[PDB]
Design a protein around this ligand. Structure first.
Ligand SMILES: O[C@H](COCc1ccccc1F)CN1CCCC1
Length: 330
């Protein structure tokens, strides 16, 4: 089997991407944030504290003939950015772009933190990291991909995120028309539950490539590119007026600037992020100070290849017995 679904930026800055997902019988379609940095499929639901729902579409398991309460199971998750959610668990039929999994754990939110409430466009998350990170207790549950894997033509999914445009998540096949050149594959460590890999270096604009190992994760659920302070300082030093602002919470730059590209290495291959991808617009409405798309990971504990990086590539998440990651230009 295979599946193919269009993913759409939630706003004009590509702050996140949503993908329609069918849950239950008859289908209830919710728009979920596909997140390769976590491993829970959770949704706003009929059980969510009413005051914490503001515009989201909810899953109502009582209206699904295939929904079953997973007795005694609960979940609670705290993300790297400080947001959180928790609740109970159902199993139900879940379909993405024509690919159907029966008995998928669908985690129903009873509580969500303010940042989720405040984002009316995101009805939940669909985690695509390794199932070892799943928070369901006392019996850990499998991700959608993990459940689908055996049935897929090939045990892979691909992320093809657009810049200010729709893109595609495919399951079970590689669309050879979706990228240019070849796909370069690189090793993955699953020890921390993430799609963790090692970049071979970087360049800033037309500058010389610096060969240096940078360990990090491929995370579709993170908006920006978080890299070591040395790397980030070298990038922003090329932008007149750019500076790190403690008050704003990162590097900012004049909105009048044209930004240089940023290149990262994948083996002997190179992925180039155009400068425009690195512009996240005014820090506040009407400001001429703009927020940078490349930020320091110093406060995080891990480097994160988020959407800023991933949208410059066609990315293969290879879930074979020995997982790997593939990157191609597009
Ligand atoms: O947790 C990710 C972002 O992680 C990186 C990060 C960004 C900013 C501050 C601290 C951090 F760790 C956001 N995702 C959004 C949906 C689930 C998590």
């Amino acid at each position: 089997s295979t599946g193919s679904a269009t993913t759409t930026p939630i706003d004009s800055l590509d702050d996140a991407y949503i993908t329609p997902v069918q849950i239950g019988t008859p289908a209830q379609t919710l728009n979920l944030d596909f997140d390769t940095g976590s491993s829970d499929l959770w949704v706003f639901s009929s059980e969510t504290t009413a005051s914490e729902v503001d515009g989201q579409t909810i899953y109502t398991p009582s209206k699904s003939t295939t929904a079953k309460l997973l007795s005694g199971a609960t979940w609670s998750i705290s993300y790297g950015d400080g947001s959180s959610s928790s609740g109970d668990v159902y199993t139900d039929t879940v379909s993405v772009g024509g690919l159907t999994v029966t008995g998928q754990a669908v985690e129903s939110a009873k509580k969500v933190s303010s940042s989720f409430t405040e984002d009316s466009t995101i009805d939940g998350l669909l985690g695509l990291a390794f199932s070892t990170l799943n928070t369901v207790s006392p019996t850990q549950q499998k991700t959608f991909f993990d459940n689908a894997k055996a049935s897929l033509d090939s045990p892979v999914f691909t992320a093809d995120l657009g810049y200010h445009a729709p893109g595609t998540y495919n399951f079970g096949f590689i669309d050879t028309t979706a990228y240019t050149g070849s796909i370069t594959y690189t090793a993955v460590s699953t020890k921390q539950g993430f799609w963790e890999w090692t970049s071979t270096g970087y360049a800033v604009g037309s500058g010389t490539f610096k060969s240096t190992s940078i360990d990090g994760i491929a995370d579709t659920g993170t908006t920006l590119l978080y890299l070591p302070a040395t790397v980030v300082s070298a990038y922003w030093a090329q932008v007149s007026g750019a500076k790190s602002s403690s008050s704003v919470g990162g590097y900012v730059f004049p909105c009048s600037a044209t930004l240089p590209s940023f290149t990262f290495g994948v083996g002997s291959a190179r992925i180039v992020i155009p400068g425009d991808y690195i512009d996240f617009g005014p820090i506040s409405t009407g400001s001429s100070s703009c927020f940078g798309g490349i930020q320091s990971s110093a406060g995080i504990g891990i480097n994160i290849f988020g959407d800023v990086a991933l949208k410059a590539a066609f990315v293969v998440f290879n879930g074979a017995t020995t997982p790997t990651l593939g990157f191609a230009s597009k």
